Symmetry: D2
Subunit: 415 residues, 4 copies
């Protein structure tokens, strides 16, 4: 049994693909594999009060199909919360509600996802040219192989730690913050250092401040203060479906301009309201004569070592150009992520995938990796296209249109 | 040919009824009559900057059917503006855009509306008990009569002038502001009085201030200053579909409490931003030493007379308890509207419509007028239910649910 | 030793009087008596997130003297927080900070206030006509009497419980909320009813929701939901110094109009942001499937009785026109306050003090009670002038100008 | 007659210096010279709706002296606008009002500024080492020379045109926009190109859109859309008086970090509200089917030539890496400014001013240029210290503290 398409990973990106597949009139067979027990959308960072960074209109389907049974509006309606949500007049749902939306959409799907199923490798199918790939899936009980004419790799962002710092029992990456935090005794985390100046760092520091009245926090970041995230309407157009075209068709010079001017729409920046909330908290503590939030600006965490009852953090101060040590109980590195990279999963197939000048994967407008003639099977990327398709690649901005384009590309080829 | 339902008027209320009819699986015959040449949704007040007072989610259908082909979102999508609209992050479309939405929905409708067709009377059909009504329709060429088992009266708010003031060449009701304004020579309206403290008064004054840099405006209103319209989330729940039940089932005492506490969600109040824009304009004029906006507070317009080249407005000052005259070129009365009242149109049938203690029409939960057993045909009201169904009656808050309930009531009773 | 002026009470009103006395070139002797150990500005309601309802520019002096050493800006500067405060761009300080401001201003004052000094009575001085009053002061150790040519009564709002409900160990007025709350064991207040729909009720409910994750709260109020407080710029002008004149000189009819249109600037209303915060909290609980906030709308608390371990609250539902019982651990009545009334302290002196039609005290424009010719001593009111001077009377809106006018009145009469 | 200090230029910077001189107990003699007839604070850009980019608390004195007779608050109070301004609850005055504040402060000053007086050169006074400077002043009638022991150069930002583009009758710099615009027939500017993506470009485009209904505007800028200006509270701390020390004492690496992370607090960015106003305008034009605003993104103006009745603008498109021509009536270059540079005015004295590695003037913490021992006279810079003191140098953020520090430095040295 050869599938038209196999999806690796089941986050929002492949969920929207499943939705696109179901809504399409095209009869395409598919299978999806997720290594976790169920949809798990950055649960380590499901902090109380966490808000979506994207308007509810940018959901699984709406921009493609304005009357989808899988829209956020349909979800709210079924949950009997549409009226309540509309009364709020807020475009940005909480992360908790969006996580629900995903699970609700997944249940509504006809298809059935295979969970606890980790893709361990992707191999050339039989024959030359290669017309299919073999997908090696490992479950808790067994291992198996599925064959598909196309594969969509959507395995998500990859946590990045500071250079010279490794995760450990007392050094966590923000992506695992709640995993570790719920285990430890509250009275054992009285001193926390959080490295970073982005949304994760801000959200974690705010949470620590709100969670216990006596926690002391050291917010260590390279900027002089949090930088506001830009989602004003003109800059925000870089996330438009049509902006994918502008970026893709644009010269390298134009692509560089997008990053140079609008990186602050997503990377190393913090939502306005979270910034203001943090500033108010700091101010009130001052008024109360009980400061707890220590902002260590113009600085980088450069090392961590466990010394007895202390996690000893080495901090480099740019202002003085010298490093020094800071003792805390835990170091949380909210130091961001690297883009998805299909390389590892691809193995041997990588030989047939064409790279650019800077040694990155060449990808077509329809999200299909460029391959030599030796490979005829479609390898599509949802994620890992920052350099070809632009800043929407790792985000929720363009799920509906990308998934629709991928489905269309596959139908166009099959036939 | 007897219709299941005839709609009198084709504003948003009956348009949503048409949409509900089309989306219903029920096979119901219908005809709609609109006196005007086309949909004309308060065009007299289609001022340049005018905004909807209601979230775009409160459209023709969405609260009832979250995936309607007639939703505002579908409209934006077809107009290729959904992405642009989402970039704005504003729940409130302009009135211009919403007017378009109505015309777009009307065109999409399978049904064909009869324009230039004014319903002049509604009469008892043949037989006892009366099982149908006869609808007298006057067109420019002819007159005709159609028969229907049910009728939905949705003829809209009725302009209300101040007591002792009649409309004329130089005394306009706000509803006909742009009609008159476009005709006159700009250099002829250097002095305008606008009576009222509500949304219409504020929008007209702002427009006059923005339109020509020399116009002098007298804003005459009973309050000490504009009162803000309340649409904060808890108060705003009075517009919920479920709040219709609370109001309807509640005692007279509870109904009175809705008006006593939440009248300021809609009547005699002004949108926050329009208030602030007016205040900033007044302020800047002061800075410039060139005041143009004269706020005449704690006052009522009590009369108007034309004396030569002046419209002489009699103003009563509450503070001084005396009246005085103000000469301007034009008096605009933005003094509001009375609720729709089916009475006049009903003629003979009214005898069989049951009234309450205070002399108002009794109406059932499904919007159907209470009649004696002499009348078995359905008379439904969209509008004119302020006293039975509450503050959403004249508004766009609840189009989707009301139209759906009316259609359901009719299907139920057909059987 | 006869003082020119004696102040009864030492809240913001008399503090601003002391400031006005010190800034005045007039050499006036004075004494101030406060019954508490120190300035105590609604400490029972000093909740964690509580914000001023008035801009920082409306402080002790600024509207009168734009370069006062006692301004909020001077205070921030001295406290080395001016720059930090300005970075916030928020006109509204926290209540905690403002309480500090009062203390700071009081310390700066040359004059020494007499604390732990309760004024128990005010009596006629000697002579005919009466040219001074005798002020009976009770301290913990002794009692004494001081003599003054003028007296300024500023003893503040008086808590008002619902009719038929008395304060008790388990029935508290909001004004004493933190007093009682700090004593009780947290695990003993799992069920709280809060009566009222105003700022106090909303702040208390928000605090209870934020303070412990498992407290269940019943918010019982007559409206269908919180009504927003209006401070949009035109309505806000009722608080202008010049608006005192408009209200004072205006007919009774005009005075009624201020209340009829603008009572929502202060009474039975809630700040926009606090409303939205509460709505978001309720929403998130619903998403989490763990509702804790129970809004009991269109209702009044009409009785309370303690039965065993339960406080039994009798609630009257307007919708059903029937009462019923609700069992909680504590009932908090956030049911507001009555205006200051000088009647009580005045005792015998009432006889020389003139009343109006509705039987209230007549007061001159300079805040001086109207007396017969037999009394020539000045009795001034800061508070209790709602009916003569308008809505600014109990508020902080007009401290600077009123205090300045009282001082001027006193200097004028001396001469 | 030798002055303690001579100020070159009389904008806000030297105006705040004069105020600091007057408030200081130090007896210092001074003279100020302004080339223009009066204070002229970017009048070329005094567009109708233009707002301050800085809180009113950052005025001529307040951060230094919280009770200055020259504060913005004092100004509002004298102008009987303080109450009105406070009702607005907006920290940002209009530019028109601020211009008024400057002139009001200037009039209140005891000192008399010398207008129509252009400093043409600064020369070494007699003797070695040089203890004074000679200041050559040119008036319309005469020329003269004054002698001073210190000089403060505050001559303002210098307009910068694009490389390869010169100003002319039809190519204007934004600084002279209104000068030219109020000298041309409205019906003659139907087509305007505005180069730039900063605050000036945005305001000019908005103004053109609002000013006439039929003007067509080409907004040409290198970014993909306007980038929002950051003034959220933590990033905004770079403007704190104390942040001057952090920047000054910090390593070059730290100074670079300020620019790398927080350039977007001022340069090449647009105020949030102006961005949104432009987006709403573009949207409504689209709805109306009458587009007028043409956004030419990822582009630079690289040349301009007059050809008959057309101004021919050469545009370079980064996306296509090619240039093309655009014909309009006028090209407005809102392409920014260069920092003040004392070099030209200094002439011979420059030999003795010490430069850094990158060829820029060394400046001490007290704003005094570093000189060799050959020069003992003080040369202070208000402006031109971006590289030593940071981003507040050309701004209004820190007038009060800088002027106070300069006065102090001068008193100290005279000592
Ligand atoms: C805390 C936080 C919060 C947000 C965001 C990021 C972060 C860190 N994002 C960006 C984020 O990337 C986006 O929300 C989605 O997670 C991306 O969808 P994907 O389906 O592509 O990856 P995603 O990371 O969601 O899913 C990948 C899945 O594949 C699985 N997987 C990995 N390897 C596998 C293998 N070998 N075999 C099988 N399964 C495998 C993973 O387990 C995972 O379930 C975001 N963006 C935005 O626009 N708005 C927002 O609000 C947010 N919110
Ligand atoms: C200026 C302005 C702006 C708004 C609003 C009011 C006003 C005055 N409203 C309220 C307004 O009532 C609502 O927008 C609808 O117009 C009500 O729908 P009907 O369809 O009920 O009225 P209308 O929309 O008033 O429907 C009446 C139609 O029937 C026709 N008609 C009447 N008698 C007839 C006859 N005998 N024969 C044939 N045709 C006849 C009329 O010509 C008219 O076209 C509003 N509410 C809200 O919630 N949000 C908002 O943004 C606004 N905006
Ligand atoms: C919780 C809360 C919060 C606010 C407000 C009210 C409440 C309940 N208010 C209104 C409030 O009335 C105002 O802030 C001041 O408290 C009023 O100033 P007074 O000096 O007149 O009375 P205030 O009540 O402040 O002081 C009266 C004093 O006299 C003392 N006293 C009474 N009898 C005495 C006696 N016989 N002898 C000696 N001393 C006696 C009392 O002990 C007390 O200290 C307000 N308004 C506003 O405009 N902005 C705001 O932010 C707030 N905030
Ligand atoms: C359109 C616009 C609007 C703003 C701003 C800039 C621009 C371009 N700015 C920044 C601006 O630089 C600041 O507002 C002041 O103008 C700086 O004050 P200065 O006194 O240093 O120079 P400024 O440019 O104000 O004045 C210098 C004066 O010296 C005169 N002069 C020059 N050479 C001379 C000579 N040889 N002899 C005699 N006189 C001479 C000039 O005539 C001029 O009057 C700003 N920043 C901010 O923080 N908030 C804001 O809102 C704004 N607003
Ligand atoms: N509520 C939500 O929906 C939510 C919450 C969290 C995250 N997200 C999303 O997830 C994505 C990632 O954001 P992120 O905050 O996780 O990471 P990020 O945006 O990449 O930012 C990481 C931060 O760490 C800093 N950093 C890196 N190395 C450091 C070091 N050695 N010492 C100190 N600081 C260091 C970075 O500074 P430099 O940039 O200068 O290197 C940057 O400030 C974004 O799309 C974000 O919006 C969303
Ligand atoms: N952009 C939009 O979508 C838009 C625009 C305009 C209107 N609307 C809607 O239309 C409906 C009605 O609004 P409206 O503003 O037209 O009417 P309105 O809300 O009833 O306002 C009427 C006003 O005129 C006053 N008034 C009455 N008689 C007067 C007199 N003799 N002299 C001076 N003033 C007098 C009223 O005072 P009193 O209240 O004290 O009696 C009140 O201030 C509302 O639902 C509104 O939201 C919407
Ligand atoms: N952060 C702050 O600075 C702050 C905090 C709290 C209060 N304040 C100020 O203090 C003043 C008073 O505010 P407030 O909230 O204490 O009192 P309030 O404004 O007088 O409100 C009292 C509320 O209780 C309701 N009520 C009365 N009797 C009731 C009953 N038997 N059962 C249920 N509800 C009942 C009232 O309803 P009805 O209107 O229908 O009578 C009203 O909603 C205001 O000036 C306010 O701004 C300021
Ligand atoms: N970090 C998420 C950015 C989302 C973007 N503003 C968008 O509207 O798609
Ligand atoms: N609840 C106090 C209201 C204060 C009023 N808005 C003022 O500006 O004075
Ligand atoms: N472009 C002017 C920026 C001013 C700065 N945000 C400040 O508050 O000082
Ligand atoms: K499923
Ligand atoms: K004095
Ligand atoms: K001096
Ligand atoms: K002067
Ligand atoms: K002078």
């Amino acid at each position: 049994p050869t599938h038209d398409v196999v999806g690796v990973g089941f986050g929002p990106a492949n969920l929207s693909l499943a939705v696109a597949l179901e809504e399409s009139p095209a009869a395409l067979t598919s299978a999806f594999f997720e290594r976790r027990a169920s949809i798990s959308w950055h649960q380590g960072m499901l902090l109380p009060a966490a808000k979506m960074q994207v308007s509810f209109l940018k959901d699984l389907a709406t921009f493609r199909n304005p009357a989808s049974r899988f829209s956020f509006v349909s979800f709210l309606h079924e949950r009997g919360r549409l009226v309540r949500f509309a009364n709020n007049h807020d475009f940005f749902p909480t992360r908790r509600e969006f996580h629900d939306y995903l699970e609700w959409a997944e249940s509504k799907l006809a298809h059935e996802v295979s969970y606890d199923s980790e893709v361990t490798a992707i191999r050339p199918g039989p024959g030359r040219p290669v017309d299919s790939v073999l997908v090696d899936v490992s479950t808790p009980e067994a291992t198996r192989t599925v064959e598909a004419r196309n594969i969509v790799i959507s395995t998500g962002l990859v946590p990045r730690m500071p250079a010279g710092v490794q995760s450990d029992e007392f050094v966590w990456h923000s992506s695992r913050f709640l995993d570790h935090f719920r285990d430890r005794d509250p009275r054992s985390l009285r001193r926390v250092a959080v490295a970073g100046g982005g949304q994760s760092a801000a959200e974690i520091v705010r949470f620590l401040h709100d969670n216990r009245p006596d926690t002391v926090v050291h917010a260590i970041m390279p900027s002089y203060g949090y930088v506001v995230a830009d989602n004003t309407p003109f800059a925000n157009q870089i996330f438009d479906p049509a902006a994918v075209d502008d970026y893709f068709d644009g010269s390298k010079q134009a692509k560089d301009a997008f990053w140079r001017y609008h990186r602050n729409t997503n990377y190393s920046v913090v939502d306005d309201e979270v910034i203001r909330d943090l500033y108010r908290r700091g101010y009130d503590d001052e008024v109360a004569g009980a400061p707890r939030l220590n902002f260590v600006n113009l600085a980088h965490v450069v090392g961590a070592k466990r010394i007895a009852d202390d996690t000893r953090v080495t901090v480099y101060s740019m202002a003085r150009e010298e490093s020094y040590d800071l003792d805390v109980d835990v170091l949380v590195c909210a130091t961001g992520y690297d883009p998805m990279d299909p390389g590892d999963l691809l193995g041997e197939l990588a030989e047939h995938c064409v790279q650019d000048a800077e040694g990155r994967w060449q990808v077509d407008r329809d999200y299909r990796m460029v391959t030599t003639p030796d490979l005829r099977c479609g390898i599509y990327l949802q994620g890992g296209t920052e350099h070809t398709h632009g800043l929407s690649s790792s985000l929720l901005s363009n799920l509906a249109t990308r998934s629709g384009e991928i489905v269309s590309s596959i139908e166009r080829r099959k036939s």
